[PDB]
Amino acid sequence: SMFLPPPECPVFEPSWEEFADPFAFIHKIRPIAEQTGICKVRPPPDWQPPFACDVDKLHFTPRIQRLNELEAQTRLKRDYTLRTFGEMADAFKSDYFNMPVHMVPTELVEKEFWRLVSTIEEDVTVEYGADIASKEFGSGFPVRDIKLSPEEEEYLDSGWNLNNMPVMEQSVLAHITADICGMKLPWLYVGMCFSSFCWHIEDHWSYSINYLHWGEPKTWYGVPGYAAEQLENVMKKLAPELFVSQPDLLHQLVTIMNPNTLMTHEVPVYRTNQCAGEFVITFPRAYHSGFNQGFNFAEAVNFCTVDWLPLGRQCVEHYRLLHRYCVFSHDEMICKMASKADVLDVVVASTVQKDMAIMIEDEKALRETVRKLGVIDSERMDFELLPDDERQCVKCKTTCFMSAISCSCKPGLLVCLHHVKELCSCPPYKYKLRYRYTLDDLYPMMNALKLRAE
Ligand SMILES: NC(=S)Nc1ccncc1
Ligand SMILES: [Cl-]
Ligand SMILES: [Mn+2]
Ligand SMILES: [Zn+2]
Ligand SMILES: [Zn+2]
């Protein structure tokens, strides 16, 4: 009546057999889970990775958070130990409800969360931790350095050890040579009661997977990928400020918003409570948000399967229309894989080949168009050697790799081939087409992929 909880998302309990290969399992559940945006995965009962750490030696810098619906917050980019944060967090929850923490029902924290973010006369602020792994604070999973016990070595090479799943081969994001620490390295999250993550989708519409190591549960809301734009239209009406253009990736604006508001406007929404030892997985372009029930510790990582490759291209196109910055060049990643075709998995090779074929036909068309605009001079250019901030289209901010237009009039500036009219005022004959590969270089790269795929 005040808050009507959305229906529960799917929950999976795979056998040890199904659980063996994470990528095969995810592909199996995909037709179900992609209809709901998020899903939960319960490992087999004995799969229990050793969590061990000293609570006094792990230090981190707290972030502070105000809890107001529709208020703008910026995406992440004093000092507590894990012990002193835990003491703060438990005392906060205990004093808020005048109860012992394990007696506060999850139903009630959820109802209360949505009450307090909507009421203007309540200025509740909370603190939390969010960072990628480092020397002061490292993965909750076992890693190779210090001598390990025989049980830790069981879990060293697991696919569900989230340090590994970046650099596995059923994935496509791992052969990216370009550093993208923000995207392919695990993030660590220390929660407390009501600390919250705003509605968002992952960069390049990737998957993500989140493991709760220990502590009180984490409440999630998710929207399936097909409803992404309905959600965005609802957000535009109620909070147009979050949609003002922004000069950086470090400046994206996000917000808290009641799922009942979305459901009233006919957006499908699902929920779950994630408990300790459980995985939540999010699918491409699935919006999600949530909040912590109490003191806890989670670890999460982005990833990309072969299924995702077409969506990845559509995402970069969508960023161009929006003038949004990219994290990496998609075409650069495709060509890097093509150049390693002999050592690729064969299903990977087949799917890359299909994306490459589309890339090449689009590039052919674009080059013909700029030639008819009077750009005649051309020269090969190794785009992958340029720092990213040195090869963005002046107009749409896309990261160039296949080709760009330059002019000696504006040294160092580039436009992609969609924005040739936007570089400067000189006539086209003064312009130059800079290209990574000729069409003749490209067709044999694709053929190598076809042979590997048979
Ligand atoms: N505190 C947490 S688990 N935050 C996030 C951030 C982004 N996506 C999912 C969870
Ligand atoms: Cl408030
Ligand atoms: Mn996320
Ligand atoms: Zn452009
Ligand atoms: Zn010029």
UniProtKB/Swiss-Prot annotation:
Q: Which GO terms describe its biological process?
A: branching involved in mammary gland duct morphogenesis; cellular response to fibroblast growth factor stimulus; cellular response to leukemia inhibitory factor; chromatin remodeling; lens fiber cell differentiation; mammary duct terminal end bud growth; negative regulation of DNA-templated transcription; positive regulation of gene expression
Q: Describe, from its UniProt entry, the tissues in which this protein is expressed.
A: Ubiquitously expressed, with highest levels in testis. Down-regulated in melanoma and glioblastoma. Up-regulated in breast cancer (at protein level).
Q: Which UniProt keywords apply?
A: Acetylation, Biological rhythms, Chromatin regulator, Dioxygenase, Disease variant, Intellectual disability, Iron, Isopeptide bond, Metal-binding, Nucleus, Oxidoreductase, Phosphoprotein, Repeat, Repressor, Transcription, Transcription regulation, Ubl conjugation, Zinc, Zinc-finger
Identify the residues that the record assigns to the JmjN domain, covering every copy.
9-50
- Give yes or no: UniProt keyword Nucleus: yes
Query: Which parts of the sequence are C5HC2 zinc fingers?
Result: 393-445
Q: Name the positions where Fe cation binds.
A: 200, 202, 288
- Molecular function GO terms recorded: DNA binding; histone binding; histone demethylase activity; histone H3K4 demethylase activity; histone H3K4me/H3K4me2/H3K4me3 demethylase activity; nucleic acid binding; sequence-specific double-stranded DNA binding; transcription corepressor activity
Q: Where in the cell is it found?
A: Nucleus
- Would the keyword Iron be found if you checked this record's keyword annotation? yes
Which domain of life does the protein's organism represent?
Eukaryota
Q: Tell me, what does this protein do in biology? A: Histone demethylase that demethylates 'Lys-4' of histone H3, thereby playing a central role in histone code. Does not demethylate histone H3 'Lys-9' or H3 'Lys-27'. Demethylates trimethylated, dimethylated and monomethylated H3 'Lys-4'. Acts as a transcriptional corepressor for FOXG1B and PAX9. Favors the proliferation of breast cancer cells by repressing tumor suppressor genes such as BRCA1 and HOXA5. In contrast, may act as a tumor suppressor for melanoma. Represses the CLOCK-BMAL1 heterodimer-mediated transcriptional activation of the core clock component PER2.
Subunit structure comment from the entry = Interacts with FOXG1B, PAX9, MYC, MYCN and RB1. Interacts with HDAC1, HDAC4, HDAC5 and HDAC7. Interacts (via PHD-type 1 zinc finger) with histone H3 unmodified at 'Lys-4'; the interaction is inhibited when histone H3 is methylated at 'Arg-2' or 'Lys-4'.
Q: Which disease is it linked to?
A: Intellectual developmental disorder, autosomal recessive 65: A disorder characterized by significantly below average general intellectual functioning associated with impairments in adaptive behavior and manifested during the developmental period. MRT65 patients have moderate to severe intellectual disability, developmental delay, and facial dysmorphism. Camptodactyly is present in some patients.
Description of its domains? Both the JmjC domain and the JmjN domain are required for enzymatic activity. However ARID and PHD-type 1 domain are not required for activity per se but contributed to recognition of the H3(1-21)K4me2 substrate peptide. The 2 first PHD-type zinc finger domains are required for transcription repression activity.
Q: What is this protein called?
A: Lysine-specific demethylase 5B
Which organism is this protein's natural source? Homo sapiens
Q: Which gene holds the coding sequence for this protein? A: KDM5B
List the range of the whole protein covered here. Answer: 26 to 753 of 1544
